Design a protein around this ligand. Structure first.
Ligand SMILES: [Ca+2]
Ligand SMILES: [Ca+2]
Ligand SMILES: [Ca+2]
Lengths: 614, 276, 49, 49, 46
């Protein structure tokens, strides 16, 4: 049957030719495009398929924004410009509003060959741009294809036919092979064969004359992309109604156990954790199509953190207990193409079968394969644990209204923040591992410094405006971002990086503490100051983060006096914190302060041990 | 238009740090002035057939030259960012003649009650009308310190064009847009401000016998336009009433006692209301 | 200042031995002596208190 | 708990949910388990043994 | 399928918990309410 492309449709691009594979991205912190050939093909989509999705958008006006950006840098010093700063900043805001207005108005229209479009990466919310003034990384005479948050003139593309069957002015049909030509570059988007050195199997994407064709694979219609409707590819929390607990999957005893976590929090729906997030999937005939959610559809639930699929299978342990009920128990299986992982969705009121599923409606889960209903059990998973927090979940053939779940939607911004935190933790760990051996390069130092600045702006909740990052003052920081930074092991990597330059591995530390006063280590001082700034921002007005940081007090004492800004962090930690100062202070810290007074006599140590006893 | 958009050079390095002969007109740009002049002369003497033949030619494909001229004016004057008080650094001594010619050609497209052309210009997709209102309201720098006559000519031509837009029509289909762009206040302060400049220049004498581009005449044209717009704005009607306790109304009484309304019937037996 | 903050809220474990050196007469003479800068005198005042 | 021909102020009942699935303002669905609370007594109707 | 309750509907009340059974009455002359557990249940009405 098929149909035409429309503005607002969500689709993926499949390279075909010399190298074939879906176009994807390396991460939120990296701005490179990658074709991965061994991940899968049209019949077998990649496991991390939500990365490979793009959204069709019309042209955006960038004139006023271009004027604002192109010389917002400091290049002159007079006293006759602030009025037009405000004036054309307001003009750029008005242009953004007009872009959004025309985007909403034009949504749904059919895309024809020869039109100009922009590709928006849903995972990153970043447009796909081609820079004509910059060469490619692994190729010499190509152009650089990257991702930009706001886009520019390089975001525009010609949608052109790869087949002589189609001609300019013809509507674009789903499944067609097209050619993506940038407006200002004139070279079709090319899926090169130059493998990336750092990520195995990744092939660079650049702009050069070639024969590559991008097969447009539909994933979601423009009319099925409603925020108020449950749909495939969403992230939800399965909240138990009566038990007032969240359905989580966590590793235990070298295996993944799905259970109902005994949340000790007074508020049931406050338990925001990264392991309670699930990826709703609607079963379709086409493996690469998502579609919408109907009351009579078939569903699959995918664990966001691990990628495993939720399934019910014949329990091996309690089956032996049946001969010495709960016929089957929920488990997490790695493969999601089986029939044991599929579920049926049952409403809680009188709702028509063909009607759309409301976004946050209570439901009942029925396992299609065994025709049983999900059920909550009080049997603890961790028998040996003195205070069990993992309750077994099984399924029973008898249906009841007590056992119901709530589909709590999760905003896309929260998912983007979680992914950014994961990527930042990974890159910080890699940088620390490289730095503890002293085999880094200048570009890596630039990358880690800009990463730390982005971390500062991320935790503080603000946006970059050219103001200094070290001496910036914000309002009360974002709370959930502080929670993310604690949970996603960002603090652990920060501590490891702070210990990295002075770490010894048998050949002596690569840097000396009192040697930081030289001019040759200005970037290292900058890195340490940014690390202590993110520490101070993370511990502010938060109990759990302060408790987490206070464990490293013995480590972070001995770096005071080297102008690494440990002063402000340690003062803030000791000032607005009362109980932690009671149970994490012993004679060791007092003796350390006394010794620091004795060797390097200066009043501020005296103030430090004076104000921590009052 | 493409050449202007690509080659426009507004230095925004003088634009982000401070108040806390070059690239002569191209041939493809210089040729616009004779083109606009010819297309103007095609429509003089209120030639109705050639006036409405430039918008719908009744051929296989129709090219609208009126919209294209409006877009040319919009792009040369500074697009949407120009109409936010940024006209000063988009208009130089080189392009004053071209903008003047565009304004005159647009006026003669609209002169005479050519309803279709007026509707087309007022309700166009682009934002030229905002540019015209910005020309009337906002001052120009640094042209406003060196060349007064050029700025006066620009303001006079913009006033004439807006009068031609609202010429002999009392429908509320085009006045609401102009009211949306500029509130009644700025109208009233512009009218007031023109009066002091006019009286100062008239007190000097030396052959000031009713100059065409005098600030007094520009203020009078603005007052006529406000009078025509007031039929769809009760707030503007209240502000236009003279004798108020607020000082500075002497301009309002001066303009109210020199403005006349009559009422004629056209050859096709329709009535039009004329303010002069 | 450290002594003053050390001897807060009826802390005899420091008062019993610190007071053995700084009697009322010495602190009060430091009070009257205008030669010293006023900050040191204020520290003496809070210590005596 | 008795029966009265004409009724009185004791005839009034609150229809309330026994399940956390339902909330005040939600329509009552056939087959639901509810709690009958008198207006002027405040004690749910009890099926004693 | 099911549906909502409406004013004017005729329905019975089934106790469930410590003691289960339909609420009934002893007679026209007696004004007492009674739950009879052994009369029947949802599958077997009294
Ligand atoms: Ca096809
Ligand atoms: Ca996933
Ligand atoms: Ca029910």
């Amino acid at each position: 049957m098929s149909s035409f492309l429309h503005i607002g449709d969500i689709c993926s691009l499949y390279a075909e030719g010399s190298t074939n594979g879906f176009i994807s991205t390396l991460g939120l912190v990296d701005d490179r495009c990658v074709v991965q050939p061994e991940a899968g093909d049209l019949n077998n989509p990649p496991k991390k398929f939500r990365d490979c999705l793009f959204k069709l958008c019309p042209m955006n006006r960038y004139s006023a924004q271009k004027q604002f950006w192109k010389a917002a840098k400091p290049g002159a010093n007079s006293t006759t410009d602030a009025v037009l700063l405000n004036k054309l900043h307001h003009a750029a805001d008005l242009e953004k509003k007009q872009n959004e207005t025309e985007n909403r108005k034009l949504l749904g229209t059919v895309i024809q060959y020869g039109n100009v479009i922009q590709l928006l990466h849903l995972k990153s919310n970043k447009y796909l741009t081609v820079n004509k003034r910059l060469p490619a990384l692994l190729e010499k005479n190509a152009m650089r294809v990257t991702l930009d948050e706001a886009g520019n003139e390089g975001s525009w593309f010609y949608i052109q036919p790869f087949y002589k069957l189609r001609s300019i002015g013809d509507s674009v049909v789903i499944g067609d092979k097209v050619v993506l030509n940038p407006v200002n570059a004139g070279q079709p988007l090319h899926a090169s064969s130059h493998q990336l050195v750092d990520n195995p199997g990744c092939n660079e994407v650049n702009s050069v004359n070639c024969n590559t064709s991008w097969k447009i694979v539909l994933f979601m219609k423009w009319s099925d992309n409603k925020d108020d409707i449950l749909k495939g590819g969403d992230v939800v929390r399965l909240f138990h109604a009566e038990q007032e607990k969240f359905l989580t999957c966590d590793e235990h005893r070298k295996k993944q156990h799905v259970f109902l976590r005994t949340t000790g929090r007074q508020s049931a729906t406050s338990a925001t954790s990264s392991k309670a997030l699930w990826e709703v999937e609607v079963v379709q005939h086409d493996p690469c199509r998502g579609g919408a959610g109907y009351w009579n559809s078939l569903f699959r639930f995918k664990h966001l953190a691990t990628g495993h699929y939720l399934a019910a299978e014949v329990d091996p342990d309690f089956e032996e207990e049946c001969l010495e009920k709960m016929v089957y128990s929920l488990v997490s299986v790695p493969e999601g193409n089986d029939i044991s992982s599929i579920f049926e969705l049952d409403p809680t009121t009188l709702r028509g079968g063909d009607s759309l599923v409301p976004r946050n409606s209570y439901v009942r889960l029925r396992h299609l394969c065994t025709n049983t209903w999900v059920h909550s059990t009080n049997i603890p998973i961790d028998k040996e644990e003195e205070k069990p927090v993992m309750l077994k979940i099984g399924t029973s053939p008898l249906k009841e209204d007590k056992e119901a779940f709530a589909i709590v939607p999760v905003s896309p911004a929260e998912v983007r923040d979680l992914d950014f935190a994961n990527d930042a933790s990974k890159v910080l760990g890699s940088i620390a591992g490289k730095l503890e051996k002293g085999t880094i390069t200048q570009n890596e130092r630039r990358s880690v410094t800009k990463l730390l600045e982005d971390l500062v702006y991320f935790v503080t909740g603000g946006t970059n405006s050219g103001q200094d990052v070290l001496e910036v003052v914000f309002s009360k920081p974002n709370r959930e971002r502080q929670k993310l930074m604690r949970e996603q092991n960002i603090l652990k990597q920060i501590f490891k990086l702070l210990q990295a330059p002075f770490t010894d591995c048998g050949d002596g530390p690569m840097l000396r503490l009192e040697e930081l006063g030289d001019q040759r280590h200005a970037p290292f001082r900058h890195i340490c100051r940014l690390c202590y700034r993110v520490l101070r921002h993370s511990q502010q007005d938060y109990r759990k983060n302060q408790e987490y940081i206070a464990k490293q007090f013995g480590f972070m004492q001995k770096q005071i006096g080297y102008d690494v800004l440990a002063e402000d962090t340690i003062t803030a930690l000791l000032h607005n914190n009362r109980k932690l100062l009671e149970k994490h202070i012993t004679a060791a810290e007092i003796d350390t302060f006394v010794s620091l007074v004795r060797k390097n006599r200066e009043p501020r140590f005296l103030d430090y041990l004076s104000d921590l006893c009052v | 238009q493409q050449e202007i958009k690509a080659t426009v050079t507004v230095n925004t390095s003088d634009l982000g740090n401070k108040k806390k002969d070059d690239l002569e007109m191209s041939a493809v740009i210089t040729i616009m002035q004779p083109i606009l002049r010819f297309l103007q002369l095609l429509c003089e003497n209120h030639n109705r057939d050639l006036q409405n033949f430039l918008r719908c030619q009744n051929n296989k494909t129709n090219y609208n030259l009126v919209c294209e001229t409006l877009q040319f004016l919009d792009c040369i004057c500074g697009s949407t960012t120009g109409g936010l008080g940024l006209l000063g650094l988009y208009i130089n001594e080189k392009n004053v003649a071209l903008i003047n010619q565009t304004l005159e050609s647009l006026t003669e497209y609209c002169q005479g009650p050519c309803h279709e052309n007026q509707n087309c210009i007022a309700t166009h997709e682009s934002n030229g009308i905002d540019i015209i209102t910005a020309l009337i309201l906002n001052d120009i720098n640094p042209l406003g310190k060196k060349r007064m006559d050029l700025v006066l000519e620009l303001k006079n031509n913009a006033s004439k064009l807006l009068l031609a837009i609202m010429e002999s029509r009392h429908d509320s289909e085009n006045a609401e847009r102009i009211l949306y762009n500029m509130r009644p206040k700025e109208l009233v302060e512009v009218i007031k401000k023109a009066y002091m400049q006019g009286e100062v220049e008239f007190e000097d004498g030396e052959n000031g016998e009713d100059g065409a581009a005098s600030p007094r005449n520009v203020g009078h044209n603005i007052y006529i336009l406000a009078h025509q717009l007031a039929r769809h704005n009760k707030e503007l009607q209240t502000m236009l009433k003279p004798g108020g306790q607020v000082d500075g109304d002497e301009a309002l009484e001066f303009y109210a006692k020199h403005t006349a309304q009559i009422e004629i019937v056209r050859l096709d037996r329709t009535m039009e209301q004329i303010v002069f | 200042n450290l002594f003053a903050r050390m001897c807060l809220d009826r802390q005899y474990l420091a008062i019993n031995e610190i007071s053995g050196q700084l009697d009322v007469d010495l602190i009060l003479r430091c009070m009257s002596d205008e030669n010293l800068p006023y900050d040191l005198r204020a520290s003496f005042c809070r210590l005596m208190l």
